[PDB]
Amino acid sequence: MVISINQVRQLYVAKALKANTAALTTAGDIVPKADTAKTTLYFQSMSPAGIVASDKINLKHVLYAKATPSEALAHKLVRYSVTLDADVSATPVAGQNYILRLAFRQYIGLSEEDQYFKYGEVIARSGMTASDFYKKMAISLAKNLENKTESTPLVNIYLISAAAASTDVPVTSATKESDLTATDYNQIIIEETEQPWVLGMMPQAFIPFTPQFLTITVDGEDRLWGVATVVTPTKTVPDGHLIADLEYFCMGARGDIYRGMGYPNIIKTTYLVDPGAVYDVLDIHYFYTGSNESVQKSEKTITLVAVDDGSHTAMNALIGAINTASGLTIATL
């Protein structure tokens, strides 16, 4: 997760808050340290190799200092609801080929902005009702997008029966109409998916989409049958993978910048962020001004992560300590 820096960013993990430098025993233990006059602030953190101290912050040169709740960094998974509009026809018209399109803004493995489609075919006959249409359209979509052949779909397909109205019925490339035995299917939902993530190689990223409907002839008029409305998300993607990458990149500012390049001849860094946990972040932007003739500012920032347990307890205590030490007025989560 290579990022843009105001000349530097440093990350220290607040795995545990201790009162004194003597209590720093485990890796991740941290203590905010400031003098009694409150001229400078620094952090003493226990690395796997002894305690390390952060840069010293001249508390007159602090540009801003705010903390996040770990809900701001979460990515809701977008999901639409597809439905055939009662205006054109509340039920499929025989003989017409219904072709649904999923307009993706990137390819599966690339991040450049492009137009990328996936399709779903259904040909309607004299007796086919709405339920059977959604069924066959869903299975077509699955067999066409869940042709991954290595890893996982690009979007997930479900069906909702009018009886449930809330129970998403999954559909996969293996599903077949024999498995789907309901008769009150009323829509199709299409959620985004969590794509593969690698620590310092593949950044967390999503591929949005839009369900587009091609034209059918109903009364000699080419018309659009579908309704791609956006129902509210129900699933989320936390920041653990996002934060872990922040550490992986910001540990090359005080540690080894190479990371596997000369693979046999490397230095391997131990990372304390647990991808799988949810961290609430804190950040302090400051600068160094200098002496006569040296007024140019060297702006910097020190950010700190801490696991959230619902209530942002860990970070709330950490900032309470920092406000008690440096006298700042950082706000709690």
């Binding site: 340290k33 003098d35 009694t36 006059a37 400078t40």
Partner: protein, 50 residues
């Protein structure tokens, strides 16, 4: 004593006025320490800790 003083050379001046000569010395220094203090400005005693 005459043979003693007759060993050292003699140098003639023009008057009996105080004369002076410039002295060239050394450069390489190191500075002492008056004291040291912690981050809060308290002085470090000899029985104090690191």
């Amino acid at each position: 004593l005459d043979t003693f003083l007759n060993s050292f050379p003699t140098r003639e001046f023009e008057d009996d006025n105080e004369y002076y000569w410039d002295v060239i010395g050394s450069s390489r220094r190191n500075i002492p320490l008056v004291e040291a203090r912690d981050e809060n400005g308290v002085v470090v005693a000899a029985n104090a800790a690191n």
